Symmetry: D2
Subunit: 270 residues, 4 copies
């Protein structure tokens, strides 16, 4: 089969940002939008189908669909608060398993939703992946970029729950990051921006969409990239309970990691 | 200067779409978001800056700026939208009044609706070079016309040649005389695929009007398709492609219509609209063109001007 | 299913490395293998491209020297390997190994003579006819788009139509299917007010002179043909269902049979779904038949 | 202002054509000019490229043969044209560039890279910031690929700038590169030099890797990314490749950030004295 179909469950802000970016980057032959409001998914797909009709965009098949479209889907994107999200995962995941494929997790809480779909159903663990702290990484690379006027791509390292930057693994242009900069100030600037965008913009659809496209490009091109993604831990860094075409392959600072593990654990119990 | 700055007025659905499509396609070194709701413009800009930080996206400068950024801007995409003609006419008069007072060499890409009215307001009320003013116009309808026949016959929409001319709101008519699918008449597809259901030219035009009203209601807005059309015109001016595309602008006697903004084939180059291409319309198509000219002017006069 | 896309490029010469590089630049496949008799050239061309794919802006596209066993899990197999009979022997030997390892890949012919090589790999083997394609006059179409573009400073993309016939010789412009920016190309002289009206026979000769000039001035033609190959790769990988001019064995189109020529054909994910026999005028029909006389003459000479 | 970007490619040989074609594939310019003494081959390369840009998915990039007068409004001027004879070529082509322009970013690819970059940045009064040399940028692509093919990991993960592999500033996705052996340093360095010549003896030259390297620098200046990448240029303190910030205005500042570095400076200096 010379076709690549990526399904996007949930056709809201983030949902339309992920599908539109998939069409802009041309990462799929057919894009299906699933959502309770079929009118929203159809309109978003129909409007996207017009964009794909441009002279520079490939003829990507955008159209409304159902869970049946997950059968031939190369990737399936899923777009007190923890329990409600888990209930949604039980419905979409219950249908995906009934029909089949890599599953990219976006719906929030991310760490919780990714855990629900990775333990409550009989799906290959490698095919389950959540954006995780990939967004915080993008933000971390942007904070230091605007601080010293340097390409964000220079900023290296990862950023826990989608919430701590591992300064030991970070480095710009090959050397450590370091008036004077404050390691706690950068962390404070991260949590504030995470609250300012949602408060001033109303949602975060562009960053999440780009982070999702990165994982899509990794799974589609089998790059074997080591990126901060969500995955049920199995003793990694004393905590328990590589992005490729076949899913996931292998994997003071330690205190913050365990602190986040205790935060998600409390959410898992609730 | 090795930089290309694109300012985008309006940070709403249509304004954030054209901004993110400009970043996905990498059509600007610095993208500036301007909107009365500065909080929305900053949030969309900051969120976009996080996307550009990806490993595959160039370091595009996304930030909340003021009209001062339009001073050295290469393109100014105005999308700040809302009787409908009068309200938008006042909005276009405010945004344009601030642009002329800072720059007069940037490219103006009209997207706000009514498209024909907005393009006519900023083009005749101010002393901005007319060539540097362009409107998406019925280019979005062209995409819809290409998609309608594409799904109807399972053919690449890009093979569907021609234009959809007229008004971008309701008076958008397809000029069947200038159309053609893959080097042969569009009406022949029924004979090629052996379809007993004859291709009704009227049905296709009506279907183009229903889909336009379905998306605006079902989806609640139209920001995806329109964002791509703006990128096409942005690519035409950034690459000096001299592409003859259907964009909206004040007519200067084409088809006998003057003092009215409509969508007709016009060459888009680095300097904007180079010239117009008066393609011979049929007696029925030309009648639709004049009908569309009276529709926009009936709305322009109703709002004053 | 398979989330990977694998393209096979037989022959790692100028054109061979032009298609693999262009593919890598556009990112069309997950793994691209170069199969050439000169394994050193294929390894060198692949390795050099492997360094490019390692860029921060380029995906991790797998570049490596492979053999015909790689064609088993391949979605597309681009072939860039008296001249008509000699190449026919290369196609029979090359295609002889492709049919043994796979029967579902897309065969995109680029080797010259294009029409001869396309007919050899399409009739002398049991490969699915729909999965056999050749660039054909798609390259000549680009030249036609650029000639009218540079002559009137109009976007070549606006130049609609086709160049049909045999690739490299007997190629004619299908004026009955052409037209710039929705209007006839002949109307450009009236729009731009050109005293020296457009001579159709002048651009046809220029279409053949430009081909000989590049080969004599540049030494070869690998850039334009590489883009045409990527266009067809995009048509099959994105299931675009595009009606483009590609070479393939005719089965009654224009009364021409037993020869491969470039005519309007719809390219889908499964290759050529069907052909579109446009209404060629009396003069163009003779050019379509004259091209068949040259192709059949080459096949008979083999 | 100017809404179009113009790039000039001096020398249309393998590397030159690879750079111009990739600039067209990535659409990093509105007009590409191929200047070369062999006007025939530059015209054909540009004419052949003009056909590729006539595609549906390719912007209308103006490809044509030009002269040094095109460098007047050229945004970037790449130079893809033992060490002495090449210095005469760099001095002749540069003397014509400075004679008509003074604001175009200059990228150097001619060999010797370190010598050719120093020849154009010393015998003329051109802004130093607007000079640049690919240098070891391609060597880094090799170091990333060798480690990528050695452990089947993304080459992008591999970090650090080869300048010799400057192991003191390298890393794989943020963790020690040696950890992959658990899931040497002098051996990959030998592979880093033997592979470069194996491609030259097997393929005949190296134009694909170096072409994207230039494009990597083209994207850095056309987008004002301020990316700190290893590029060859005039070395003051700390021509040779070192970590430098690349932006639209050229090289803004340098990043200092050892035995092999001094040996390379002595070799480049010895070649400059002989020229
Ligand atoms: Cl096409």
């Amino acid at each position: 089969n010379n076709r690549r179909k990526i399904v996007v469950i949930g056709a809201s802000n983030v949902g339309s940002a992920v599908a539109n970016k998939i069409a802009d980057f041309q990462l799929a032959t057919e894009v299906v939008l699933i959502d309770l409001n079929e009118d929203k998914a159809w309109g978003e797909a129909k409007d996207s189908s017009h964009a794909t009709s441009c002279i520079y965009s490939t003829n990507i098949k955008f159209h409304l669909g159902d869970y049946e479209d997950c059968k031939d889907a190369n990737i399936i994107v899923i777009t007190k608060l923890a329990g409600t999200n888990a209930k949604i995962m039980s419905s979409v995941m219950g249908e995906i398993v009934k029909r089949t494929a890599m599953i990219i997790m976006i719906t929030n809480p991310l760490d919780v939703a990714t855990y629900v779909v990775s333990t409550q159903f009989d799906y290959p663990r490698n095919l389950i992946l959540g954006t995780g702290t990939m967004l915080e990484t993008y933000r971390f690379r942007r904070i230091l970029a605007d601080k010293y006027q340097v390409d964000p791509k220079n900023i290296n390292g990862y950023v826990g729950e989608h919430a701590f930057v591992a300064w030991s693994t970070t480095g710009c242009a090959g050397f450590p990051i370091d008036e004077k900069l404050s390691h706690e100030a950068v962390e404070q600037e991260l949590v504030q921006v995470a609250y300012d965008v949602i408060n001033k913009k109303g949602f975060t659809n562009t960053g999440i969409a780009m982070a999702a496209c990165r994982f899509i490009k990794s799974v589609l091109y089998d790059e074997h990239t080591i990126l901060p993604c969500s995955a049920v831990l199995e003793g990694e860094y004393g905590i328990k309970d590589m992005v490729c075409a076949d899913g996931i392959m292998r994997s003071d600072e330690l205190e913050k990691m365990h602190k986040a593990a205790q935060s998600v654990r409390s959410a898992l119990d609730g």
